[PDB]
Each structure stands twice: as structure tokens, then as C-alpha cells.
């Protein structure tokens, strides 16, 4: 550890540009896995409707599928509004 | 492939881009998606020797969608005939 700190002080004195580069590059690799917000990036992208939502033929056995856009069933974006 | 490593491992290295009726971003279909699908389904599993003869109708339709040679030829015929009649003043086109 002490040898690790002595090495870091040496590079900080002689090559601060490279030290900063490696530190930034290390944060870029690591921080997405530690961030609680990374999961919303997946959800927001999926929630963007690029193409038409084709309706399903009602067979009488789809209680979880809304009949009207304003009916309660179906995905909600309330989590996105509060974000 | 010479060595079918992809099927052995179940990994998809390049099959995803081999045909235009495969899955596409945002379900954007190719122009000849329905023709490719019909031809692929006709020819599936019977081998190319058989498919060359038995799926010829689907393949001929698919090739027509791809390059549109017959369609262009038919349009060429109608346009060529129309120019003849107009050159002879026997036809006036509607607005």
C-alpha cells in the first residue's frame, strides 16, 4: 500500500496528464456498475414509442391488457414523470 | 460455415445480418420482407437441390421484388405505346 502511494505521488509529480487520463478512464469503466441511476437509462429508452403500438385481437382472456389508452391496465410512466 | 462453431456454442456471431427478414431495429421491415419470408419457409430443410425446383415460384417472385425487371419492362411498354399514340394525336391524357 505504501509502495502504491509512493508510486502514485511519483506519477502525479511527473505525468499529471497521464494520471488524470487513467483516472477518468477508470471511472468511466467502473461507475456505471455502481450507480443507482443506470437502471433508469434502460427503462427510459424502452419507454420511447418509435413505432405504432399494434392492438391485440381480444379473445376474452386478457384481463391485463387495457381496452382503452386511459384504462388502468398496461405499463405506467408515473415513475418517469416523478424522475 | 465450414466449422459451425456458432450452432455448436449457440452464439450468434453473424447470422443476425445474413437475411433481410431477420429482426431489425425498431421492427423496420425490408421492402421484400414478405417475399423473402415465403421463399425461406418454402425452401427450409429440404436442401438446395430440391428447393431449386420446388420453390421456384417463391424465388421468382422474390427476385421480381428485388430487381423489379418485369415491372419496369411492363411500364416501359405502356409508356412507349402512349408516346406513339400521342405522337399520332390519337390520345389525350387526363389531368
Amino acid at each position: 500500500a505504501e509502495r502504491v502511494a509512493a508510486f502514485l505521488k511519483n506519477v502525479w509529480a511527473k505525468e499529471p496528464v497521464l494520471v488524470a487520463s487513467f483516472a477518468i478512464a477508470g471511472l468511466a469503466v467502473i461507475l456505471p456498475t455502481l450507480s443507482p441511476y443506470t437502471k433508469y437509462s434502460l427503462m427510459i429508452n424502452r419507454a420511447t414509442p418509435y413505432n405504432y403500438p399494434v392492438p391485440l385481437r381480444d379473445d376474452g382472456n386478457m384481463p391485463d391488457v387495457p381496452s382503452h389508452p386511459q384504462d388502468p391496465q398496461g405499463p405506467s410512466l408515473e415513475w418517469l414523470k416523478r424522475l | 460455415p465450414f466449422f459451425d462453431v456458432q450452432k455448436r456454442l449457440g452464439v450468434d456471431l453473424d447470422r443476425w445480418m445474413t437475411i433481410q427478414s431477420a429482426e431489425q431495429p425498431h421492427k423496420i421491415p425490408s421492402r421484400c420482407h414478405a417475399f423473402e419470408k415465403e421463399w425461406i419457409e418454402c425452401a427450409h430443410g429440404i436442401g438446395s437441390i430440391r428447393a431449386e425446383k420446388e420453390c421456384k415460384i417463391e424465388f421468382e417472385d422474390f427476385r421480381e421484388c428485388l430487381l423489379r425487371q418485369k415491372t419496369m419492362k411492363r411500364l416501359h411498354a405502356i409508356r412507349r405505346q402512349r408516346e406513339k399514340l400521342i405522337k399520332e394525336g390519337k390520345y389525350t391524357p387526363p389531368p
Binding site: - | K27, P29, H33
Partner: protein, 63 residues
């Protein structure tokens, strides 16, 4: 070896060789038919796999 042993040993040799010769002729005939007709496990050249096809609703309806 007595003549009987050689005689009947010869028959066993002839039976094996005759059976192999018939199989050699049948294989040439089977291969000829499979290659011309394509209905056998041999000369089965691949066609595109239909499990690659996406069947979900598309961005536009006409397909």
C-alpha cells in the same frame, strides 16, 4: 489343413466378399439417386434456416 477346412473356409470368404460386392453396387446406385433427386441425407446442401425470420408486427403493416 484337411480339404474340408479349406473348402468351408473358402465358402466363408466367398460369402463375405460377395456381400461386400453387392453393397458396393447398391451404394453407387443409392448415391446416384440421392444426387439427382436430393431427397436423401446425402448431397443435402443447406438452405437458409427459417428460425432466423422475425414474425412480430412491423413498423408498417404491409409485409
Amino acid at each position: 489343413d484337411g480339404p474340408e477346412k479349406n473348402y468351408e473356409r473358402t465358402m466363408a470368404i466367398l460369402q463375405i466378399e460377395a456381400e461386400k460386392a453387392e453393397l458396393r453396387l447398391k451404394e453407387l446406385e443409392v448415391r446416384r439417386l440421392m444426387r439427382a433427386r436430393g431427397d436423401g441425407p446425402w448431397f443435402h446442401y443447406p438452405t437458409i434456416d427459417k428460425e432466423l425470420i422475425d414474425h412480430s408486427p412491423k413498423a408498417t403493416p404491409d409485409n
